[PDB]
CSV table of C-alpha atoms and ligand atoms in Angstrom, one decimal:
chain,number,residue,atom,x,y,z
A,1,UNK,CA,-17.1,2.6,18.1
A,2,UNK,CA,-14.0,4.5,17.6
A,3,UNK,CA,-12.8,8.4,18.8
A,4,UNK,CA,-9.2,7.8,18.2
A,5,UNK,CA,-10.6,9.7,15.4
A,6,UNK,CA,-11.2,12.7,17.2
A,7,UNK,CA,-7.9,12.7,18.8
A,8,UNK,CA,-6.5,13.1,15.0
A,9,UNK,CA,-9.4,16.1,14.5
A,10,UNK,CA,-8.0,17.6,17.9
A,11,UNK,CA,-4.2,17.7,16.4
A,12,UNK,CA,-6.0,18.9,12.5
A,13,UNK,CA,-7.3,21.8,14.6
A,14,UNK,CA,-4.1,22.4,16.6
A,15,UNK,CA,-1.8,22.8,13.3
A,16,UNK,CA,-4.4,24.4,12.1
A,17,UNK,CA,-4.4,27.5,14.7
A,18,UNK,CA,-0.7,27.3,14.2
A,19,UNK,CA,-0.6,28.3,10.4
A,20,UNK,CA,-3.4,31.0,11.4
A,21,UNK,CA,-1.6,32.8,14.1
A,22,UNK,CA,1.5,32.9,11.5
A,23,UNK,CA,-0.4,34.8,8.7
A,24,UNK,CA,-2.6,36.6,11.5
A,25,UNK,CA,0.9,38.3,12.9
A,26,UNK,CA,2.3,38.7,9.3
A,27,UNK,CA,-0.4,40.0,7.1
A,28,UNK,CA,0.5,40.4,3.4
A,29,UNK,CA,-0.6,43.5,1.8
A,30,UNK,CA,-0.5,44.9,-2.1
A,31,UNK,CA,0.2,41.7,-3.9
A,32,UNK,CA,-0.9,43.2,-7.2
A,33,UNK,CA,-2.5,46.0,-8.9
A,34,UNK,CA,-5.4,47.0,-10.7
A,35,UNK,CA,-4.0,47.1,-14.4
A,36,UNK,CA,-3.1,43.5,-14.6
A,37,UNK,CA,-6.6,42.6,-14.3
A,38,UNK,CA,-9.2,42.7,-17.2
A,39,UNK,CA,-12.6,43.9,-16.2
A,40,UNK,CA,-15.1,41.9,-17.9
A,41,UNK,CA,-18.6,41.8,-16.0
A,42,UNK,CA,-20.8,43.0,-12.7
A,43,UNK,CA,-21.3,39.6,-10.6
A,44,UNK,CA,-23.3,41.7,-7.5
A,45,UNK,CA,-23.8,45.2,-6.2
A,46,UNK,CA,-23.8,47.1,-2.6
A,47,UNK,CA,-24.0,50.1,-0.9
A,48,UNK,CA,-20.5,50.9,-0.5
A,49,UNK,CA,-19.1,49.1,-3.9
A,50,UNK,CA,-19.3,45.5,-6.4
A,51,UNK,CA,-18.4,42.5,-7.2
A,52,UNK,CA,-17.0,41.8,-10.7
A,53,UNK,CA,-15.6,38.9,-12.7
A,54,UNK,CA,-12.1,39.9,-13.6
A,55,UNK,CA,-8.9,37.8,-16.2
A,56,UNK,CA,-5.6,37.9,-14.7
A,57,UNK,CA,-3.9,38.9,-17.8
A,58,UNK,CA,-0.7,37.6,-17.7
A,59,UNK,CA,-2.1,33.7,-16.8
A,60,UNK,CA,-5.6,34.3,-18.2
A,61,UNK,CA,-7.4,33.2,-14.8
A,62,UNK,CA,-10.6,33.9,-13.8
A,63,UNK,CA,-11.1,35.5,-10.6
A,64,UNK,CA,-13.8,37.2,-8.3
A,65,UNK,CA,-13.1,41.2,-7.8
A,66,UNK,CA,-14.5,42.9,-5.1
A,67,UNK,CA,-14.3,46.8,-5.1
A,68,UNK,CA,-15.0,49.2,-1.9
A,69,UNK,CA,-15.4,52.6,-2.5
A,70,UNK,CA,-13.5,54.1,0.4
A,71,UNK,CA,-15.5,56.9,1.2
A,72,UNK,CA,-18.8,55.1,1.0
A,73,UNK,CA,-17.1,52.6,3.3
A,74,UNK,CA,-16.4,55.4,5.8
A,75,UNK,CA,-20.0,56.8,5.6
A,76,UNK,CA,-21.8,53.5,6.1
A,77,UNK,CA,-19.5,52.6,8.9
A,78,UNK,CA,-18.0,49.7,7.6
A,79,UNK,CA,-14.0,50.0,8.0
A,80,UNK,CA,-13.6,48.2,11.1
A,81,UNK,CA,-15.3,45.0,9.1
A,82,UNK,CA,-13.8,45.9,5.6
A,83,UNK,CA,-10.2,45.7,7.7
A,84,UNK,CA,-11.4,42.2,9.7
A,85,UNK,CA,-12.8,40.8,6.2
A,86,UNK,CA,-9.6,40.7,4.8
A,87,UNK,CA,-7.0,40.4,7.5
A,88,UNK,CA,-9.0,37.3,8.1
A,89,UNK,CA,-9.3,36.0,4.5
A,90,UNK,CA,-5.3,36.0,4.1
A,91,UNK,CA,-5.3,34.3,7.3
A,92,UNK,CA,-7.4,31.7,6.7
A,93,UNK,CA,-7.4,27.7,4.9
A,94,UNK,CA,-10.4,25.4,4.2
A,95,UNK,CA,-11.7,23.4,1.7
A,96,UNK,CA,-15.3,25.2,2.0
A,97,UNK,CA,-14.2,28.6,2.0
A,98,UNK,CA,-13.3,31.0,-1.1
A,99,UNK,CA,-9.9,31.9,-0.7
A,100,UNK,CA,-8.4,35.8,-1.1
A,101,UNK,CA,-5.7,35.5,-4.1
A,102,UNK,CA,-4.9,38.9,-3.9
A,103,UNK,CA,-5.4,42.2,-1.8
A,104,UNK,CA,-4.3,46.2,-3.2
A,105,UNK,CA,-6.1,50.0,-3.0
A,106,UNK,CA,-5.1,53.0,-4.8
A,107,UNK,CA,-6.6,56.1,-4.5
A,108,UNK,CA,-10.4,55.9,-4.5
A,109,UNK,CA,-11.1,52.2,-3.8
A,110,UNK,CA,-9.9,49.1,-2.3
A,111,UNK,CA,-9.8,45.5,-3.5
A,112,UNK,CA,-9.8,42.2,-2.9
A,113,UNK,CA,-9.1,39.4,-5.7
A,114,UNK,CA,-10.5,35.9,-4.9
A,115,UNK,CA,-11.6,32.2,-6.8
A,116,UNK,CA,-14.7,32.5,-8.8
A,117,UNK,CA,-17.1,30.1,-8.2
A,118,UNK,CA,-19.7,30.1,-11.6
A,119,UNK,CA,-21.6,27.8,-10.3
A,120,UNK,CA,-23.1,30.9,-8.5
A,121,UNK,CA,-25.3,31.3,-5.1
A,122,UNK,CA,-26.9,28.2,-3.5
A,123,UNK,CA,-30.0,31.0,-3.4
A,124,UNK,CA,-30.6,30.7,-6.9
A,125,UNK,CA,-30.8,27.3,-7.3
A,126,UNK,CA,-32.5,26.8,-3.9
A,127,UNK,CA,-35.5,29.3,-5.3
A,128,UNK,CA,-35.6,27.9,-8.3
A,129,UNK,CA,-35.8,24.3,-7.4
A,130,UNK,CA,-38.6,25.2,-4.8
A,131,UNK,CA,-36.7,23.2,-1.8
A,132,UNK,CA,-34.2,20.8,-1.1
A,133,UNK,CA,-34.6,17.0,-0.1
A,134,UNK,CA,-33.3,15.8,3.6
A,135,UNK,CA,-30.1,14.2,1.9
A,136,UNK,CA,-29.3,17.2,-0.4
A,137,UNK,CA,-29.8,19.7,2.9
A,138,UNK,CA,-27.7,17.7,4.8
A,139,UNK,CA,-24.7,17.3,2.5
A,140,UNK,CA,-24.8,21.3,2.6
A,141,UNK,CA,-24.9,21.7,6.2
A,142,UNK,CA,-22.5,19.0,6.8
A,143,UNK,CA,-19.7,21.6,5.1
A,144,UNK,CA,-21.0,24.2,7.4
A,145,UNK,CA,-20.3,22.4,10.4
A,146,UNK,CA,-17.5,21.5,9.5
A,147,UNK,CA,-16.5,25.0,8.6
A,148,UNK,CA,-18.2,26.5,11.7
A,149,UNK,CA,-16.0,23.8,13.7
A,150,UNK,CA,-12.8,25.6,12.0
A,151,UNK,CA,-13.7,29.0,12.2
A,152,UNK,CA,-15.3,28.8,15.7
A,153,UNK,CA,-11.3,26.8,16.8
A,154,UNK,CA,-9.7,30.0,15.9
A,155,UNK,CA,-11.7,32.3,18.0
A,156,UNK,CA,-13.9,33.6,14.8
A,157,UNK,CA,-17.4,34.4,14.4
A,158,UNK,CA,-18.8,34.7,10.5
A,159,UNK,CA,-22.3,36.1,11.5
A,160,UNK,CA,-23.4,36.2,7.4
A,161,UNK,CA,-24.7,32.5,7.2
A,162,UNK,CA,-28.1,32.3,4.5
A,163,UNK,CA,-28.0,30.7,1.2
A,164,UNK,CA,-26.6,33.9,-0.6
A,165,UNK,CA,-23.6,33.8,0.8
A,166,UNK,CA,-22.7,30.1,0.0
A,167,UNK,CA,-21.7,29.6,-3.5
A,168,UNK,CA,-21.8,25.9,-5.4
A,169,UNK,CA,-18.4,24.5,-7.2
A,170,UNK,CA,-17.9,22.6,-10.5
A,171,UNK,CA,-17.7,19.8,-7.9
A,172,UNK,CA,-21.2,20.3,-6.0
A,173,UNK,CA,-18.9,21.3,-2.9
A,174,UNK,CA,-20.1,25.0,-1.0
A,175,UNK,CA,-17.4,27.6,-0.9
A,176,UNK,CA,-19.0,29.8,1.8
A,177,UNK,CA,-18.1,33.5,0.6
A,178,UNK,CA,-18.9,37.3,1.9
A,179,UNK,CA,-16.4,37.3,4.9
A,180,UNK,CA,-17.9,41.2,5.5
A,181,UNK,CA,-19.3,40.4,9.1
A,182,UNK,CA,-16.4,38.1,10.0
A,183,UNK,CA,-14.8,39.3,13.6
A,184,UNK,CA,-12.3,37.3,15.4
A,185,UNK,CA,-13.8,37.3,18.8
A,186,UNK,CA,-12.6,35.4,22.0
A,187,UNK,CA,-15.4,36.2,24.6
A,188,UNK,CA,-18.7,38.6,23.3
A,189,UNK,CA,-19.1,41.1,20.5
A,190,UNK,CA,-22.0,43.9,20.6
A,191,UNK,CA,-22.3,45.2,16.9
A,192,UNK,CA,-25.5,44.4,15.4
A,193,UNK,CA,-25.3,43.5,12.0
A,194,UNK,CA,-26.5,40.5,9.5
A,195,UNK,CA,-29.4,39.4,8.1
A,196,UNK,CA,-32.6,39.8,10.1
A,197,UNK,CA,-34.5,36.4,9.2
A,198,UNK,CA,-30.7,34.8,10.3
A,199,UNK,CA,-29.8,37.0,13.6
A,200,UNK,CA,-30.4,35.3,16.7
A,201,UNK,CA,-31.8,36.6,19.7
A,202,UNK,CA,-29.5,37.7,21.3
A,203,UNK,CA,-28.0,40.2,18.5
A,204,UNK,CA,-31.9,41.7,18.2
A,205,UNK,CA,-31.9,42.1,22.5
A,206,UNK,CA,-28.7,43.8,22.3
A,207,UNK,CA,-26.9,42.5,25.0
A,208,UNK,CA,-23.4,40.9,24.0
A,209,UNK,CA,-23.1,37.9,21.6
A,210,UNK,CA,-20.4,35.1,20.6
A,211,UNK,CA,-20.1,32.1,18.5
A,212,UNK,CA,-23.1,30.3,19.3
A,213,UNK,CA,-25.3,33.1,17.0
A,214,UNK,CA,-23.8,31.4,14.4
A,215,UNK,CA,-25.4,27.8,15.2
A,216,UNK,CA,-28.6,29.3,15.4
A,217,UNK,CA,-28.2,30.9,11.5
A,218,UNK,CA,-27.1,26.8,10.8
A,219,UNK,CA,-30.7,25.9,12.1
A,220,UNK,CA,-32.4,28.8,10.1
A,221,UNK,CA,-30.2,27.7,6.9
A,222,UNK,CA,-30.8,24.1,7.6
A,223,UNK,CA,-35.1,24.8,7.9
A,224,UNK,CA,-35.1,27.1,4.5
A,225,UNK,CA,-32.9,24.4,2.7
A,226,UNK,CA,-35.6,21.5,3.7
A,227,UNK,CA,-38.7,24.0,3.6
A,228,UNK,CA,-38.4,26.2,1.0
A,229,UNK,CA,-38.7,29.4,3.2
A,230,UNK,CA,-36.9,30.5,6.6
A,231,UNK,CA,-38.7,29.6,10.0
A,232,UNK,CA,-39.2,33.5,10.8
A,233,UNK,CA,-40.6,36.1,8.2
A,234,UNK,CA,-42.8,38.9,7.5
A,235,UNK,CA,-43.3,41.8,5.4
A,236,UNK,CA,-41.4,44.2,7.5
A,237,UNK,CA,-37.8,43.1,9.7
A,238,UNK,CA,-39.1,44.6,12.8
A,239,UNK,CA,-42.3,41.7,12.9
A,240,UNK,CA,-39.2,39.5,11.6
A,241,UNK,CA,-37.7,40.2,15.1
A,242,UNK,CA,-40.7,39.6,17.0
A,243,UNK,CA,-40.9,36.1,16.0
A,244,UNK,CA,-37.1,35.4,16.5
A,245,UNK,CA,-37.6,36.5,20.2
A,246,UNK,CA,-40.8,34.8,20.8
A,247,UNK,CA,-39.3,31.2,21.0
A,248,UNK,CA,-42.1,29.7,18.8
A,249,UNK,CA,-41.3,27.7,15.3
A,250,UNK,CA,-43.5,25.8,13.3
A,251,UNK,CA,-42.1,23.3,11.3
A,252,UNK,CA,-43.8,21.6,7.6
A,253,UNK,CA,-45.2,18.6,7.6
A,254,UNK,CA,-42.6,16.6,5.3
A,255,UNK,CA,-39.6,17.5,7.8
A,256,UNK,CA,-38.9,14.0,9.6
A,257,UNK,CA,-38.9,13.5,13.7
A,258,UNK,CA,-34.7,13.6,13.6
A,259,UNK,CA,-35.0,17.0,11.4
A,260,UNK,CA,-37.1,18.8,13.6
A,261,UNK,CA,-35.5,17.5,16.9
A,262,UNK,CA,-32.3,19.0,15.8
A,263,UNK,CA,-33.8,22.3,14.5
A,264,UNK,CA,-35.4,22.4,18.2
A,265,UNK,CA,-32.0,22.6,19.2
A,266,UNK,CA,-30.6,24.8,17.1
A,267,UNK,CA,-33.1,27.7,17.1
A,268,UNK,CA,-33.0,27.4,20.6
A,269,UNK,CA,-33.2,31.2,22.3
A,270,UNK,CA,-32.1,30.3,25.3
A,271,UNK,CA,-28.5,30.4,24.8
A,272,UNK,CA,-27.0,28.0,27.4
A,273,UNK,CA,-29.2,25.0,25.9
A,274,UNK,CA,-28.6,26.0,21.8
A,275,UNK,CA,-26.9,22.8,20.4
A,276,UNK,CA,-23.4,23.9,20.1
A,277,UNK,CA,-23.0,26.0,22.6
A,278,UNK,CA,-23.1,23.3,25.7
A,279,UNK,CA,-20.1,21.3,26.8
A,280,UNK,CA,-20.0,18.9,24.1
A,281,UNK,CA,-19.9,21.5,22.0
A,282,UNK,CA,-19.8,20.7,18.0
A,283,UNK,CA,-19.9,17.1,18.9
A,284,UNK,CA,-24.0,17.6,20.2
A,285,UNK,CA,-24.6,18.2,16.2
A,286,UNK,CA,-22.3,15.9,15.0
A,287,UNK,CA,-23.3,12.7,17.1
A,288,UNK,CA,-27.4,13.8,16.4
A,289,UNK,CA,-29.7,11.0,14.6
A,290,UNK,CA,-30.1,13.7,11.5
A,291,UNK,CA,-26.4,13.2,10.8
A,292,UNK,CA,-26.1,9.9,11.4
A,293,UNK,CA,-25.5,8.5,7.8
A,294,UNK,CA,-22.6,11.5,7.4
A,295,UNK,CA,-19.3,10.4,6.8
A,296,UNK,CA,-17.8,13.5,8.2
A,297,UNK,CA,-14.2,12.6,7.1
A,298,UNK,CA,-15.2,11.9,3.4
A,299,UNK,CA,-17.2,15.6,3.3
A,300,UNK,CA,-13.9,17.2,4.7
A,301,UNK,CA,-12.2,14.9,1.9
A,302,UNK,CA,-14.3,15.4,-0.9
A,303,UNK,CA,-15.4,11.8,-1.6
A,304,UNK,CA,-19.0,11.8,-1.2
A,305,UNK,CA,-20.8,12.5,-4.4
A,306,UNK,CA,-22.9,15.4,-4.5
A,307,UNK,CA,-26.2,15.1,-4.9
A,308,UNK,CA,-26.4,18.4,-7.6
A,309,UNK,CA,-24.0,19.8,-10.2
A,310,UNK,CA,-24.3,23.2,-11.7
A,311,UNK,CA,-24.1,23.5,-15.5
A,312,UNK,CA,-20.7,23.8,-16.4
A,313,UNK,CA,-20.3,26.5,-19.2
A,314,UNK,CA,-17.1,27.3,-18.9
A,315,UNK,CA,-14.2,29.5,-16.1
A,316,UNK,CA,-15.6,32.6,-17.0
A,317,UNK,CA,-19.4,32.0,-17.6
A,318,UNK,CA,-21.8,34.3,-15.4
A,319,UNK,CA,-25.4,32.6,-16.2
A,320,UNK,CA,-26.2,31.7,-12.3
A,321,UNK,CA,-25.7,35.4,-11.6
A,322,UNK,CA,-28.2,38.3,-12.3
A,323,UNK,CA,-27.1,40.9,-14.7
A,324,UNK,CA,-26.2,44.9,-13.5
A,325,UNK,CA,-25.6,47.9,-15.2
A,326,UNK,CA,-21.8,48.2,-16.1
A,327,UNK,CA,-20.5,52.2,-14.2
A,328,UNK,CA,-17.0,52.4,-14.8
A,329,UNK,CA,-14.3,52.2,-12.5
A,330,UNK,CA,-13.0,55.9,-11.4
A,331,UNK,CA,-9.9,56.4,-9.4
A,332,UNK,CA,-9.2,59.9,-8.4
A,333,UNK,CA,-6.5,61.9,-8.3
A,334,UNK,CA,-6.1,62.7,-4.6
A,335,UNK,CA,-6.3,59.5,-2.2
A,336,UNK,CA,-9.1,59.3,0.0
A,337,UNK,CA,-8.9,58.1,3.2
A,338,UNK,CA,-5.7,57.1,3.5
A,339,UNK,CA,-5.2,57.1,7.7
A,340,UNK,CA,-8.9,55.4,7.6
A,341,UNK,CA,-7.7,52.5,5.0
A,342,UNK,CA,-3.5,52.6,5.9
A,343,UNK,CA,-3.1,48.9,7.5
A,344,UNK,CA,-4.7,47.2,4.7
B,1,UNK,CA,-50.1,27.6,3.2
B,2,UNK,CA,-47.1,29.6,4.6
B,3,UNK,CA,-45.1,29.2,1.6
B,4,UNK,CA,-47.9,31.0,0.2
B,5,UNK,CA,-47.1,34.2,2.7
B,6,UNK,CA,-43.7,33.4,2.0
B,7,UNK,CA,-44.3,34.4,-1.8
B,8,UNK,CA,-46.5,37.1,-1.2
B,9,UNK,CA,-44.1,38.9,1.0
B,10,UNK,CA,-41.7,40.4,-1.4
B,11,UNK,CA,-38.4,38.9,0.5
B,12,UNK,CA,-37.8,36.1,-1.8
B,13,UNK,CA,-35.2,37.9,-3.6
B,14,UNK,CA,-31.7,38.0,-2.6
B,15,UNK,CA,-31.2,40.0,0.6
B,16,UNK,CA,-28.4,42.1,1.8
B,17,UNK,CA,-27.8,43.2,5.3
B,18,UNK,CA,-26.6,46.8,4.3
C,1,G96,C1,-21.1,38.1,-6.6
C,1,G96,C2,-21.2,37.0,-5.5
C,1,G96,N1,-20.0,37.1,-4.7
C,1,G96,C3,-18.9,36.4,-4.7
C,1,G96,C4,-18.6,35.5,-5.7
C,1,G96,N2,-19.4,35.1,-6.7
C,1,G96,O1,-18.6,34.2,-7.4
C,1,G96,N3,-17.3,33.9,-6.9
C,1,G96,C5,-17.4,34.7,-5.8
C,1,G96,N4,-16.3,34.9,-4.9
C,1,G96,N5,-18.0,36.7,-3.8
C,1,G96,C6,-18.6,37.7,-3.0
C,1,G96,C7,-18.2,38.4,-1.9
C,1,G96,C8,-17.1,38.3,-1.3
C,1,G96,C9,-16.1,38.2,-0.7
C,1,G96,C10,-14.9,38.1,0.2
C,1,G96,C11,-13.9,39.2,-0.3
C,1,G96,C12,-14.3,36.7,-0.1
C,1,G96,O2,-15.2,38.3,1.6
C,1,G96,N6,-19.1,39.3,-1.4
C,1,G96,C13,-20.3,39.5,-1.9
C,1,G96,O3,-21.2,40.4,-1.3
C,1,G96,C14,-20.7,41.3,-0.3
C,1,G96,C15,-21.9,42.1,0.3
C,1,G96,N7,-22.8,41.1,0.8
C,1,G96,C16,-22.5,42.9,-0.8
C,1,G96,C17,-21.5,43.9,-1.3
C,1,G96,C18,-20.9,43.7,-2.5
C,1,G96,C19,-19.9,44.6,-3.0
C,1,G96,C20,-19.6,45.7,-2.3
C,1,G96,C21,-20.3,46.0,-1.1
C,1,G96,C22,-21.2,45.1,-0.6
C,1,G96,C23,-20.7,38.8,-3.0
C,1,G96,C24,-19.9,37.9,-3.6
């Protein structure tokens, strides 16, 4: 019966704010270059660009490459988040997050160097293994709290919360990924964006949203982790939405009384009474029965044993990722977009 | 069984919000 602890979390979070607001004023900006990297394999695709595994030459590392195509970035409407994605990933330090090695563009594209995590996407392994047990669903939403707790201290919202976007370590541990969405935000954003089994209410309505939409995608990860399948879906997004809105959940039959209290909570629509959003704040989800066997100091420390480890097949393996057809890299002779692109 | 929905829908695959 001891919150001296939380007096210690309360001065973690102050110095933690502190070595933010540094990098956030002093940004760093073409760390390397495109030529000291080997190109080796398509990890993931999009509409404005891919991921690819990459070999820093010189040291012979492994790393994560993601390349925007400039002009597709300025046709889908995407440089305002392209610009927030990595002024924020330079900015940023946690245990559960990947972490931006290096940022450069030339000029066609832009890119952005980070650790590769082989054990690939939680969404693999979660559809493949059907569902996850109450322990093993907790261990993973424990990170996110934890995460969400950092994130949320220094005034940003990640709004891109589903199981593709959280990728499993050699170590079990989540390394939450796909910063694309991420807006630092004190008071309400209005741009409507995410994944439409994840957004809350409020995004769909269209009426001015903050931090708490991203406790409400922590209850819809939370129910497809223990379930199998999200809380709200359909064959089209628009019936998707419908559900969202309506207020009504129905949970399976195996999900224990704590489980679905906490859910209840979570997916709350009404946003004044959604568990981490009252005046306790992070503490309401914390101190709940459902987390009541969490050391929340030993997740943070990486002590607690988790309860599933990828096969290991080496740094630069890629056999938890789907394969794509390899189009080569083109940089053009003109730049594109340079006023667009010209504080990154 | 709604897992059975859930696997007749085609949205089991990864999804991407663009
Ligand atoms: C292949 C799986 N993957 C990995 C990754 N797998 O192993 N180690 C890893 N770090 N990192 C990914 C990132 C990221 C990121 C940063 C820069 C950290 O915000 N974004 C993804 O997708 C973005 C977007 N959702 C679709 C996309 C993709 C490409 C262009 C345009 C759009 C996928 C990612």
């Amino acid at each position: 019966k001891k919150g001296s602890e939380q007096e210690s979390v309360k001065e973690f979070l102050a110095k933690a704010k502190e070595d933010f607001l540094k990098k956030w004023e002093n940004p760093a900006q073409n760390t390397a270059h495109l030529d000291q990297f080997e190109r080796i394999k398509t990890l993931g695709t999009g509409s404005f660009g891919r991921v690819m595994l990459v070999k820093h030459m010189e040291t012979g590392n492994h790393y994560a490459m993601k390349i925007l195509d400039k002009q597709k970035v300025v046709k889908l409407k995407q440089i305002e988040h392209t610009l927030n994605e990595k002024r924020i990933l330079q900015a940023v330090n946690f245990p559960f997050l990947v972490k931006l090695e290096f940022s450069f563009k030339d000029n066609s594209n832009l890119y952005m160097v980070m650790e590769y995590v082989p054990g690939g996407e939680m969404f693999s392994h979660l559809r493949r293994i059907g569902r996850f047990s109450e322990p093993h669903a907790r261990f993973y939403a424990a990170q996110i709290v934890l995460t969400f707790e950092y994130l949320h201290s220094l005034d940003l919202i990640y709004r891109d919360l589903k199981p593709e976007n959280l990728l499993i370590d050699q170590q079990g541990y989540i390394q939450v990924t796909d910063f694309g969405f991420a807006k630092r935000v004190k008071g309400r954003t209005w741009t409507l964006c995410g994944t439409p089994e994840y957004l809350a209410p409020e995004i769909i309505l269209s009426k001015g949203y903050n931090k708490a939409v991203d406790w409400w995608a922590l209850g819809v990860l939370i129910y497809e982790m223990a379930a199998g399948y999200p809380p709200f879906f359909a064959d089209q997004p628009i019936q998707i939405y419908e559900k969202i809105v309506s207020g009504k959940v129905r949970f399976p039959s195996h999900f224990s009384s704590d489980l679905k209290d906490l859910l209840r909570n979570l997916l709350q629509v009404d946003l004044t009474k959604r568990f981490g959003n009252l005046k306790n704040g992070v503490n309401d989800i914390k101190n709940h029965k459902w987390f009541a066997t969490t050391d929340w100091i030993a997740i943070y420390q990486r002590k607690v044993e988790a309860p599933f480890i990828p096969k290991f097949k080496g740094p630069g393996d890629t056999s938890n990722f789907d394969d794509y057809e390899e189009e080569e890299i083109r940089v053009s002779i003109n730049e594109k977009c340079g006023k667009e692109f010209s504080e990154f | 069984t709604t897992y059975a929905d859930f696997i007749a829908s085609g949205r089991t695959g990864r999804r991407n919000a663009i």
